[PDB]
Design an enzyme around this catalytic site. Structure first.
Site, PDB file in Angstrom:
ATOM      1  N   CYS A 106      -7.430   1.238   1.360  1.00 23.96           N
ATOM      2  CA  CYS A 106      -6.536  -0.774   1.949  1.00 23.96           C
ATOM      3  C   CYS A 106      -7.525  -1.481   1.601  1.00 23.96           C
ATOM      4  O   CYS A 106      -7.008  -2.959   1.345  1.00 23.96           O
ATOM      5  CB  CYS A 106      -6.510  -0.217   3.677  1.00 23.96           C
ATOM      6  SG  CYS A 106      -7.849   0.199   4.345  1.00 23.96           S
ATOM      7  N   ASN A 112      -1.073  -7.990   6.048  1.00 18.43           N
ATOM      8  CA  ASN A 112      -1.949  -6.276   6.140  1.00 18.43           C
ATOM      9  C   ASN A 112      -1.328  -5.439   4.169  1.00 18.43           C
ATOM     10  O   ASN A 112      -0.092  -6.328   4.320  1.00 18.43           O
ATOM     11  CB  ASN A 112      -0.989  -5.767   7.564  1.00 18.43           C
ATOM     12  CG  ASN A 112      -1.105  -4.468   7.379  1.00 18.43           C
ATOM     13  OD1 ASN A 112      -0.955  -3.699   6.272  1.00 18.43           O
ATOM     14  ND2 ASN A 112      -0.448  -4.082   8.218  1.00 18.43           N
ATOM     15  N   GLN A 172       0.852  -1.164   0.293  1.00 21.51           N
ATOM     16  CA  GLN A 172      -0.050   0.016  -0.202  1.00 21.51           C
ATOM     17  C   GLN A 172       0.617   1.657   0.097  1.00 21.51           C
ATOM     18  O   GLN A 172       1.552   1.494   0.684  1.00 21.51           O
ATOM     19  CB  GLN A 172      -1.105   0.030   1.219  1.00 21.51           C
ATOM     20  CG  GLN A 172      -2.038   1.182   1.319  1.00 21.51           C
ATOM     21  CD  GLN A 172      -3.088   0.901   2.531  1.00 21.51           C
ATOM     22  OE1 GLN A 172      -3.783   0.353   3.310  1.00 21.51           O
ATOM     23  NE2 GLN A 172      -3.733   2.306   2.040  1.00 21.51           N
ATOM     24  N   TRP A 229      -0.126  -3.059   3.779  1.00 23.04           N
ATOM     25  CA  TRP A 229       1.215  -2.330   3.709  1.00 23.04           C
ATOM     26  C   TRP A 229       2.398  -2.957   3.415  1.00 23.04           C
ATOM     27  O   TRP A 229       3.172  -3.082   3.320  1.00 23.04           O
ATOM     28  CB  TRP A 229       1.121  -1.760   5.643  1.00 23.04           C
ATOM     29  CG  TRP A 229       0.174  -1.190   5.599  1.00 23.04           C
ATOM     30  CD1 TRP A 229      -0.903  -0.163   5.115  1.00 23.04           C
ATOM     31  CD2 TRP A 229       0.135  -0.794   7.339  1.00 23.04           C
ATOM     32  NE1 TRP A 229      -1.263   0.473   6.263  1.00 23.04           N
ATOM     33  CE2 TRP A 229      -1.250   0.142   7.032  1.00 23.04           C
ATOM     34  CE3 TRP A 229       0.446  -1.070   8.167  1.00 23.04           C
ATOM     35  CZ2 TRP A 229      -1.313   1.247   8.300  1.00 23.04           C
ATOM     36  CZ3 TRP A 229       0.244  -0.004   9.692  1.00 23.04           C
ATOM     37  CH2 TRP A 229      -0.557   1.557   9.155  1.00 23.04           C
ATOM     38  N   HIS A 284      -8.765  -0.940   9.911  1.00 17.24           N
ATOM     39  CA  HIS A 284      -7.964  -1.392   8.337  1.00 17.24           C
ATOM     40  C   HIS A 284      -8.260  -2.680   7.808  1.00 17.24           C
ATOM     41  O   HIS A 284      -8.262  -3.868   8.630  1.00 17.24           O
ATOM     42  CB  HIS A 284      -6.975  -1.282   9.269  1.00 17.24           C
ATOM     43  CG  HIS A 284      -5.464  -1.610   7.986  1.00 17.24           C
ATOM     44  ND1 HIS A 284      -5.414  -0.774   7.001  1.00 17.24           N
ATOM     45  CD2 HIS A 284      -4.208  -2.808   7.889  1.00 17.24           C
ATOM     46  CE1 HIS A 284      -4.429  -1.280   6.231  1.00 17.24           C
ATOM     47  NE2 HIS A 284      -3.661  -2.259   6.832  1.00 17.24           N
TER      48      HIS A 284
HETATM   49  C1  LIG Z   1      -9.549   4.867   6.245  1.00 18.58           C
HETATM   50  C2  LIG Z   1      -8.322   4.081   6.613  1.00 18.58           C
HETATM   51  C3  LIG Z   1      -7.961   2.344   5.378  1.00 18.58           C
HETATM   52  N1  LIG Z   1      -9.687   1.558   6.440  1.00 18.58           N
HETATM   53  C4  LIG Z   1     -11.002   1.890   5.513  1.00 18.58           C
HETATM   54  O1  LIG Z   1     -11.119   2.184   4.747  1.00 18.58           O
HETATM   55  C5  LIG Z   1     -11.844   1.134   6.466  1.00 18.58           C
HETATM   56  C6  LIG Z   1     -11.537  -0.500   6.325  1.00 18.58           C
HETATM   57  C7  LIG Z   1     -12.479  -1.245   6.820  1.00 18.58           C
HETATM   58  C8  LIG Z   1     -12.510  -2.979   6.471  1.00 18.58           C
HETATM   59  C9  LIG Z   1     -12.951  -1.622   8.362  1.00 18.58           C
HETATM   60  N2  LIG Z   1     -12.782   1.488   6.049  1.00 18.58           N
HETATM   61  C10 LIG Z   1     -13.698   2.634   6.167  1.00 18.58           C
HETATM   62  O2  LIG Z   1     -12.886   3.215   7.092  1.00 18.58           O
HETATM   63  O3  LIG Z   1     -14.814   3.249   6.311  1.00 18.58           O
HETATM   64  C11 LIG Z   1     -14.864   4.663   5.331  1.00 18.58           C
HETATM   65  C12 LIG Z   1     -16.181   5.016   4.736  1.00 18.58           C
HETATM   66  C13 LIG Z   1     -16.903   3.594   4.326  1.00 18.58           C
HETATM   67  C14 LIG Z   1     -17.794   4.031   2.689  1.00 18.58           C
HETATM   68  C15 LIG Z   1     -17.596   4.866   2.436  1.00 18.58           C
HETATM   69  C16 LIG Z   1     -16.531   6.485   2.784  1.00 18.58           C
HETATM   70  C17 LIG Z   1     -15.768   6.094   4.136  1.00 18.58           C
HETATM   71  C18 LIG Z   1      -6.990   1.753   5.320  1.00 18.58           C
HETATM   72  O4  LIG Z   1      -6.963   1.414   6.980  1.00 18.58           O
HETATM   73  C19 LIG Z   1      -5.938   2.338   5.209  1.00 18.58           C
HETATM   74  O5  LIG Z   1      -6.172   2.702   3.433  1.00 18.58           O
HETATM   75  N3  LIG Z   1      -5.061   2.589   5.910  1.00 18.58           N
HETATM   76  C20 LIG Z   1      -4.021   3.500   5.113  1.00 18.58           C
HETATM   77  C21 LIG Z   1      -3.198   4.600   5.831  1.00 18.58           C
HETATM   78  C22 LIG Z   1      -1.602   4.408   5.824  1.00 18.58           C
HETATM   79  N4  LIG Z   1      -0.584   3.606   5.299  1.00 18.58           N
HETATM   80  C23 LIG Z   1      -0.379   3.158   3.864  1.00 18.58           C
HETATM   81  N5  LIG Z   1       0.157   2.451   3.978  1.00 18.58           N
HETATM   82  C24 LIG Z   1       0.270   2.014   4.927  1.00 18.58           C
HETATM   83  C25 LIG Z   1       1.586   1.707   6.002  1.00 18.58           C
HETATM   84  N6  LIG Z   1       2.588   1.904   4.873  1.00 18.58           N
HETATM   85  N7  LIG Z   1       2.235   2.065   7.612  1.00 18.58           N
HETATM   86  C26 LIG Z   1       1.261   3.148   7.421  1.00 18.58           C
HETATM   87  N8  LIG Z   1       0.622   3.773   7.612  1.00 18.58           N
HETATM   88  C27 LIG Z   1      -0.023   3.137   5.691  1.00 18.58           C
END
Ligand SMILES: CC[C@H](NC(=O)[C@H](CC(C)C)NC(=O)OCc1ccccc1)[C@H](O)C(=O)NCCCn1cnc2c(N)ncnc21
Ligand SMILES: [Ca+2]
Ligand SMILES: [Ca+2]
Ligand SMILES: [Cl-]
Ligand SMILES: [Cl-]
Ligand SMILES: [Cl-]
Length: 322
Positions: free
Chosen positions: A83, A264, A77, A266, A240
């Site tokens: 994610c 993960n 990622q 990531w 996540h």
């Molecule tokens: C929002 C976070 C993302 N999560 C989601 O989407 C969640 C997922 C569900 C399965 C819990 N859904 C969500 O929230 O719903 C929002 C929703 C639903 C419907 C409409 C509009 C918004 C996700 O964790 C993500 O993409 N994280 C990336 C963090 C940056 N990054 C990237 N590389 C990284 C790395 N190496 N180390 C540290 N951080 C890192």
């Protein structure tokens, strides 16, 4: 046969670019800030200002579409909230048939290359072919968003770009639902399980789903706000998407223990509890099981006991197909 998104015709555009001695540039999703986003990635944002669009053929002397297979380690990622999408792509790679429906065979940076690629998605109630040019967001010569652990491999970056395209921008991908990506790759049926009310046969449900090539994902709800941090005491990430990538049983001091493997997106940051890569539990299984199952690598992928899984995780998503 997939119908053409926006009427854009991959083979025709490719053939005409080659004839005209140019590389494709996509009017429908151009290499400009509006393809990045609108707020966090909008025209006047700090993130947007650092980004330059570059083709893999501008980055490297020997870019490759696929290297050593299109596999889950190719999903690492970048700086975007997608994610959920990337967990889905990682799961997709475990089913070769569905993988290569979404990622057509025969695409390369060598013979016949004209700066255009295509992918197939389930969208608007149709299987649609989506073209992209291969200009990708970069900063200091490196991809900003998804990239492969193999630094010269581009299929997953290009697929993430195609998925951003159908949704309007990369920023439109920030925050989402793993099951939506599962559906968009399969036209299949999604169900979810509350792990705090798990059916007694849930492990067999998972085994069967994995065997058939269904797509599985899991997550830990943030119940407070993100109070105990985003990262738990045992190095799990809340709110996540993880891919569920295997389920295998081991013999731990002469008794069966059900394990589950997840990843993960990531490509790093893993569970540190029992069955983690460095845990003592591995010292007490059959040496053959240890050798087959355990991989001591910071790769984002790890095992948990099913018992610990259902305690730590809160949601499991399964997309079943035909
Ligand atoms: C929002 C976070 C993302 N999560 C989601 O989407 C969640 C997922 C569900 C399965 C819990 N859904 C969500 O929230 O719903 C929002 C929703 C639903 C419907 C409409 C509009 C918004 C996700 O964790 C993500 O993409 N994280 C990336 C963090 C940056 N990054 C990237 N590389 C990284 C790395 N190496 N180390 C540290 N951080 C890192
Ligand atoms: Ca690969
Ligand atoms: Ca690991
Ligand atoms: Cl066009
Ligand atoms: Cl701009
Ligand atoms: Cl290639």
């Amino acid at each position: 046969n997939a119908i053409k998104y926006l009427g854009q015709d991959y083979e025709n555009l490719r053939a005409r670019c080659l004839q005209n001695g140019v590389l494709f540039q996509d009017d429908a999703f151009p290499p400009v800030s509006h393809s990045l986003g609108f707020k966090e990635l909008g025209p006047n944002s700090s993130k947007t200002y650092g980004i330059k669009w570059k083709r893999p053929t501008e980055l490297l002397s020997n870019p490759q579409f696929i290297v050593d297979g299109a596999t889950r380690t190719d999903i690492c990622q970048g700086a975007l909230g997608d994610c959920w999408l990337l967990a889905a792509i990682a799961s997709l790679t475990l089913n070769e048939t569905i993988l290569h429906r979404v990622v057509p065979y025969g695409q390369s940076f060598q013979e016949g290359y004209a700066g255009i690629f295509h992918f197939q998605l389930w969208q608007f109630g149709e299987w649609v072919d989506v073209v992209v040019d291969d200009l990708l967001p970069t900063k200091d010569g490196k991809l900003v968003f998804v990239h492969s652990a193999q630094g010269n491999e581009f299929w997953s970056a290009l697929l993430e770009k195609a998925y951003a395209k159908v949704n309007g921008s990369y920023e439109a991908l920030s925050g989402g639902c793993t099951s939506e990506a599962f559906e968009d790759f399969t036209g299949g049926v999604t169900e979810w399980y509350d792990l705090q009310k798990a059916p007694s046969d849930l492990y067999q449900i998972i085994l069967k789903a994995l065997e058939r090539g269904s797509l599985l994902g899991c997550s830990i709800n943030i119940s407070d706000i993100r109070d105990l941090e985003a990262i738990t005491f045992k190095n799990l990430v809340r709110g996540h998407a993880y891919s569920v990538t295997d389920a295998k049983q081991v013999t731990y001091q002469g008794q069966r223990v059900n394990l589950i493997r997840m990843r993960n997106p990531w490509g790093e940051v893993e569970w540190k509890g029992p069955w983690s890569d460095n845990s003592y539990e591995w010292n007490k299984v059959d040496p053959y099981e240890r050798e087959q199952l355990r991989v001591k690598m910071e790769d984002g992928e790890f095992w948990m006991s099913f018992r610990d899984f259902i305690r730590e995780f809160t949601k499991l998503e399964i997309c079943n197909l035909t």
